[PDB]
Structures are given as C-alpha cells and as structure tokens.
Design a protein around this nucleic acid. Sequence first.
DNA 1: CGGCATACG
DNA 2: CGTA
DNA 3: GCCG
Length: 329
Amino acid sequence: WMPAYACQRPTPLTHHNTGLSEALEILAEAAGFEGSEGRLLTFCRAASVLKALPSPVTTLSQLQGLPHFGEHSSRVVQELLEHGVCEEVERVRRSERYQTMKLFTQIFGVGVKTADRWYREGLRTLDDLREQPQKLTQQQKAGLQHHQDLSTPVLRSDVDALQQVVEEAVGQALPGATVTLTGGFRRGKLQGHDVDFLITHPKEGQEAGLLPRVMCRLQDQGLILYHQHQAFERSFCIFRLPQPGSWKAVRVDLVVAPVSQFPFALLGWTGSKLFQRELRRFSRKEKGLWLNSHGLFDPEQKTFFQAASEEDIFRHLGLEYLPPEQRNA
DNA sequence: CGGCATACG
DNA sequence: CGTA
DNA sequence: GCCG
Ligand SMILES: [Cl-]
Ligand SMILES: [Mg+2]
Ligand SMILES: [Mg+2]
Ligand code: NA
C-alpha cells in the first residue's frame, strides 16, 4: 500500500500526522548533528511516510507493514500515542548539544563540522562567536550579522516583488532570459527561509556568462547585502527586501541553466531535499540511471536523456508524475 | 553485510 | 570547508 | 535505522 521511496508517492505540504512527523524529524536532525547520516535518512524517511498517509495514525497496529518503521521509530510513535510525548525526543530537545548545534548550523556559512568544532571548544551562543571574530570567515561574519533577520520567515507576498526586481536585472543582463520561482514556494509553501530562482534563456548557449552580469547589476542597484563575488552559475546571496519604513535581509539563491538542462534543474531545485535524494537513489538503484540537476545518464549506452519537461523525466524513470505540491517529502 | 544524492562556490 |  |  505504501511504496518504499518518497518519489513513488504523493506527499502534500499539510497532512494528518504533523506531530508524529515533527518528533521523528527531531531525531533525524539530532542524528545529523552527530554525523550519523544513515540514521538521519531513516528517521526522515519514516517521517515522510507519515506525511503521505491519508489519515491520522491512532493505533500502533497501523504502522505494521509501513516502510522505514522498525523498532526505534515505532517506539517513538507508540510513546506519542500513549502519552503525548516521547522521552527520547524531549531529552534531545532540551539538550545543550542539540540546542547549540541547531543554533550554530542555522548561521549562513556554518555547517555541522564547523558547529561541532566550536561546540567542542566550549562555545555556546551567538555572542560567544561575535567576541572571537578572528575565527570567522567573511561569509560567516555576514551570516552572524544578519542572523536575526534571516531567522524570520519570508512571506509568499514578499517573493513576487523580489522576483520583479530580479527580472529587471536579468532582462538588462540578457534580454529574453527568464526567471522561474523554484524551491519551497514552488511546492506551495506560504513561507520560507529563502527564495530560490532559476534563470535560463530560450536560445541554447546564450545563458553562458549570465550570472556574473546579473549579480553585478543587482549589486549596482544596492540590493545585495552579501554575495561571494561582491565564472559561476549558482549564487547564494543575502538581499535587501523592503519593509514598512525600512527593510530586512533575506536569503536568495540564483541559479542559471542552459535551456536543454532546464527540466533537470527545475526538478532538482524544486525539492524537497528528501524528495530529490530519494529520486536520485531510485534512479540509480532501481533503474540504473544517474540523475543530477544537469541531466539523466545511461551508463551502459553512455547517453544522456533529452527532456523537454519534468513530465518527461518522470516518464523516463517509470514513475507517475507528481506536481511540485506533491513533492513535500 | 553494504548502502545511504550529487552536484557547484 | 561552505552552499543547494 | 532500516532495506534488500
Ligand atoms: Cl548513521
Ligand atoms: Mg528555499
Ligand atoms: Mg535555497
Ligand atoms: Na548553516
């Protein structure tokens, strides 16, 4: 009844098992902070299975036969069903290790490895990091300075005005180039912690060299609070977004792809992260084909699949098409 | 047991 | 290392 | 942590 890969089933943004999935995702996140990527994946997959169910889990028996539910994930659900809390989850939540790793990894420019090193050095708060600026990269300094604004969600109502500003710079950089909203907003989210855009041009090859030209124009408009080039095809920036009487910093990702690759880039950048990992795993392990954001490779024939749409890609993988709103794994 | 997505800055 |  |  429930297939094993998240790319084989629709997963809507809102669902019927929110509390159970959130608890499993705490355990997944904590596994990542300890470097246990396998455990992270299992807990994420188990949470995602619950998101895909048609109604609430009320009884432990309803987990029998569901993929990714073994002894540990079933016990978590059992405790939530019987007591409304799971002791392991609550112990993680209150733990100094979890809280500090979460806070540090939320900083733009800081990953698990850096956060863990700082934790082992005794650092615990953002002000601890600010007092030791010699140990920070320029990217991390920007992430730290902007952390408060970047912690507040972007509204879908903000995304449209931002897209128009990006489109104006893109049109001057290369007339005819287009801007497509991707990421979580394309999956239907009403908020997010950044905004993701994919840029292309209908004439193959015209997009070469485009992103530096776009970034220079946005910087000249005064809109870029931070970017790494203040040749490339992805830029992870901090943008100035207007607010009543002021403004706030927002994370924006910009990506350029040639139109031949656009369906693959659109698929990859639309997410969710788990959906794409599961889709690439399915492609390789079940179909023998290698998938990335540039193409789909048959390693036996040594050929790439041309695709003109995301629908083409799902068909070439033998999967029923899922619209972006059903990719919220 | 091996495997766990696969890129670019 | 960081980012997705 | 779980699948195959
Ligand atoms: Cl692990
Ligand atoms: Mg996003
Ligand atoms: Mg993003
Ligand atoms: Na980070």
